[PDB]
Design a binder for this molecule. Structure first.
Ligand code: FAD
Lengths: 130, 16, 666
């Protein structure tokens, strides 16, 4: 019992002629060879990439500064902002790491309070070009 | 025929 | 089963339904009311019971009525009708009983029986039991037909029939009660042993045997479900279907490897595409971190654009350091999903040589059961008689199976060394010409009302005819003769001066190296009291090994035995015997089989009697003259002894019905 894997379609594909049996069996036998040595190909291509990535990014990580968020805007942080907007658009996340001691919300606040004075409109349309 | 087997009687295809 | 129902089942009859046969003799009952059917059926089933209880005495009609209880003993003609139908068709009072009423003083009709094979003897005894004059013509100098029992000193070994295929419903059961037979059970354990001389390990032996039966069940479903039954306008053999099913399996092993390795390339390619993204970020990181280093070179205080260039390149690098960390994270999941796949491969093959040479042995076992290459068996119908399988342990007759034909022959007119040659059957009766096998020259003429032909199917197939039918058999019969299969299987018998095998195991296998040699000495039997080992030669090997001298064969035999049990525990055999049944002029093969392009309905054509045409033109259509019995005529029990036996009981009743009339049918 345990009815063998037996489809209709498969049957005459092995009975069509005398050796249509050893036809398809040898078609698969070489198909497996084909992919099998393809694996060895990408298994070595990938081995080369794996070596180029030696060291990781360890020499290149900069200690990140852990520092408390403040409320007021030193003219410095105001000015970091205007250039962060010119380079980052509306990413508010990025603008918050650059400025360093502002969370993401008073970033938003900034866009509206100093809207007129720092001409954010021109700054941002300047960013969209690019 | 199948009936005839003593040793390792074959079952596949038989209706129990 | 138990009771009157068990009597019915031991006589191969449904206890609760009337058969097609009894519909014929009791059409009044069958078309009648449900109550009467029940009465008959009880009367029937009751009667077989008393016969089956004591089969060593005749079961007379008076006896039956005496022991029947009311309301059943009430209608006597029904009881007479039933008891007479049972007696006529050999369901009761058959075999070797003491007679109560003595055999009629002067007889009636004359029947000539060709062959004193078991089917032959079976009829002879019934016919004589019915008051007919019966003579058997037998080409051999003994009675067994294909029941052939070697005897020398204490050694005893059948080269023919060996095994009762279980007493559950077997008429052979009745014979054994009547006859001295030492019936010995066959314990089923069969160790295999590959070509080396050492056991298959239980792991391997169960994994192949199971795969074999799985392959068999497959073919059945090609046959019956998928209707795979013609291929390039020949019938499919069990052999072909077996190869197409194995080829399908061998294919499926290759899709499973292909789909799994194809899973590896789909992820080794996601890895490639990710490693590329990760080198292209170590590159951007390399250049960013540089730029940040040149921007912290400006030393503070510095104007705020310079301050933001340091701060910017810091975010931009930490952000590219986030993107690269998320990416050797994910490179971790894929790199281990890949040691995962490469760890679970699908199986490498369908079957290895060691497997396939073991699977071959189960094919040899099928080729033995059918006495033919599986390439000749009919796919649809080879197993068409499985329904009528008996129940119970198979057995051996420990004093030799021939003790049964011999016992049956007692009391009978049997002419030996009488080779029938021509059968002439005519509107007025029958002449059969036989020669004497010793001095061919002494010719014999036998005249009779009818001839019962139990000539082996292979004899009937002989080209040129070993027997001439005058007139020739009609096309419908001779066509069934070709279509039918008559195959071959032989036996090698080894007698020793000491038990060197395992005396508590009755059989064991030998595995063949080639597919071709899969039949050659593939199965051994320890069956008799004396130290005798007996080996089968089936399959394609059957016909081959006849060409090879005994010594060469007993050679390969002792060789296989030495490998198994050790070259120093295997003595020279005291006496050896090789069968050659296809060579035997009176056998011409071993037994019949459902050849490709045949069906079991050919068995039925085989058993249809022949009615010669009128002597005078316009004279009316005669009475059938030429009847047929033997294993190749009994569809539901082919190729066995009990089937031959049954066929002989059959014809004998049919003849008597045609020549003594059937009082029991009104
Ligand atoms: C090797 C082998 C092993 C077997 N093992 C088993 C087994 O274990 N169990 C089982 O149930 N069955 C077994 N059988 C099958 C069984 O032996 C037969 O099915 C049965 O004996 C055949 O009976 P039959 O009466 O139809 O033919 P036979 O018994 O052959 O009777 C026919 C008779 O006709 C005679 N004859 C032939 N030509 C002529 C002629 N021209 N003139 C006169 N007489 C002629 C023959 O010599 C023979 O005596 C085996 C068969 C073989 C070959």
């Amino acid at each position: 019992p345990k009815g063998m894997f037996l489809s209709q379609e498969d049957v005459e594909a092995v009975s069509a002629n005398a050796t249509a049996a050893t036809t398809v069996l040898r078609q698969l036998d070489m198909e497996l060879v084909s992919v099998k040595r393809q694996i060895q190909n990408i298994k070595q291509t990938n081995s080369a990439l794996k070596e180029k990535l030696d060291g990781g990014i360890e020499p290149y990580r900069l200690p990140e500064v852990i520092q408390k968020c403040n409320a007021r805007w030193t003219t410095e942080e105001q000015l970091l902002a205007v250039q962060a907007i010119r380079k980052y658009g509306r990413d508010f996340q990025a603008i918050s790491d650059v400025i360093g001691n502002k969370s993401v919300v008073q970033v938003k606040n900034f866009f509206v309070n100093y809207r007129r004075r720092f001409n954010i409109d021109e700054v941002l349309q300047e960013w969209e070009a690019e | 025929a199948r009936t005839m087997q003593t040793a390792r009687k074959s079952t596949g295809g038989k209706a129990p | 089963p138990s009771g009157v129902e068990g009597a019915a089942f031991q006589s191969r009859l449904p206890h609760d339904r009337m058969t097609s046969q009894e519909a014929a003799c009791f059409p009044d009952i069958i078309s009648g009311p449900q109550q009467t059917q029940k009465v008959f059926l009880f009367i029937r089933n009751r009667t077989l019971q008393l016969w089956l209880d004591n089969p060593k005495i005749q079961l007379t009609f008076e006896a039956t009525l005496q022991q029947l209880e009311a309301p059943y003993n009430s209608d006597t003609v029904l009881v007479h009708r039933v008891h007479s139908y049972l007696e006529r068709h050999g369901l009761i009072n058959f075999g070797i009983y003491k007679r109560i009423k003595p055999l009629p003083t002067k007889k009636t009709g004359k029947v000539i029986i060709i062959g004193s094979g078991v089917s032959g003897l079976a009829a002879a005894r019934q016919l004589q039991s019915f008051g007919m004059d019966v003579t058997l013509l037998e080409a051999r100098d003994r009675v067994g037909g294909r029941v052939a029992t070697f005897r020398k000193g204490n050694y005893v070994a059948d080269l023919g029939a060996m095994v009762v295929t279980g007493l559950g419903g077997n008429p052979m059961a009745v014979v054994s009660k009547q006859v001295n037979m030492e019936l010995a059970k066959i314990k089923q354990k069969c160790p295999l042993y590959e070509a080396n001389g050492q056991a298959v390990p239980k792991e391997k032996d169960e994994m192949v045997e199971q795969e074999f039966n799985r392959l068999l069940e497959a073919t059945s479903k090609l046959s019956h479900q998928l209707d795979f039954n013609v291929l390039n306008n020949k019938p499919v053999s069990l052999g072909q279907a077996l190869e197409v099913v194995i080829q399908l399996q061998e294919k499926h092993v290759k899709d499973e490897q292909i789909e799994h390795w194809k899973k590896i390339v789909k992820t080794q390619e996601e890895l490639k595409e990710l490693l590329n993204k990760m080198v292209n970020l170590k590159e951007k990181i390399k250049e960013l971190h540089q730029q940040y280093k040149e921007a912290s070179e400006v030393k503070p205080p510095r104007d705020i654009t310079a301050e933001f260039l340091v701060k910017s390149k810091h975010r931009d690098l930490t952000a590219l350091c986030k993107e690269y960390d998320e990416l050797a994270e994910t490179q971790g999941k894929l790199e281990e999903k890949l040691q995962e796949l490469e760890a679970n491969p699908p199986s490498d093959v369908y079957l290895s040589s060691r497997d396939r040479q073991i699977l071959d042995w189960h094919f040899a076992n099928l080729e033995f059961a059918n006495a033919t290459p599986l390439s000749t068996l009919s796919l649809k119908h080879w197993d068409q008689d499985d329904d009528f399988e008996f129940t119970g342990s198979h057995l051996t007759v420990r004093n030799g199976y021939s003790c049964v034909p011999v016992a049956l022959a007692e009391g009978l007119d049997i002419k030996l060394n009488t080779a029938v040659r021509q059968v002439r059957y005519t509107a007025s009766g029958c002449e059969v010409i036989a020669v004497n096998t010793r001095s061919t020259s002494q010719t014999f003429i036998y005249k009779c009302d009818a001839v019962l032909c139990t000539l082996p199917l292979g004899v009937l197939k002989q080209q040129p005819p070993a027997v001439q039918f005058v007139p020739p058999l009609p096309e419908w019969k001779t066509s069934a003769v070709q279509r039918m299969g008559f195959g071959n299987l032989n036996k090698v018998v080894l007698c020793f001066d000491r038990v060197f095998w395992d005396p508590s195991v009755n059989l064991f296998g030998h595995v063949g190296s080639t597919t071709a040699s899969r039949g050659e000495l593939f199965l051994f039997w320890n069956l008799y009291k004396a130290p005798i080992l007996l080996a089968l030669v089936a399959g394609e090997a059957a016909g081959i090994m006849e060409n090879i001298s005994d010594d060469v064969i007993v050679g390969r035999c002792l060789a296989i035995l030495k490998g198994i049990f050790g070259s120093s525990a295997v003595p020279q055999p005291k006496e050896t015997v090789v069968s050659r049944w296809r060579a035997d002029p009176w056998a011409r093969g071993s037994y019949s089989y459902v050849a490709a392009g045949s069906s079991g309905n050919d068995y039925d054509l085989m058993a249809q009697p022949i009615t010669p045409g009128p002597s005078i033109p316009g004279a009316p259509q005669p009475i059938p003259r030429l009847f047929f019995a033997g294993e190749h005529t009994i569809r539901n029990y082919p190729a066995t002894v009990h089937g031959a036996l049954l066929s002989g009981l059959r014809e004998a009743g049919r003849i008597a019905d045609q020549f003594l009339g059937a009082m029991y049918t009104l």
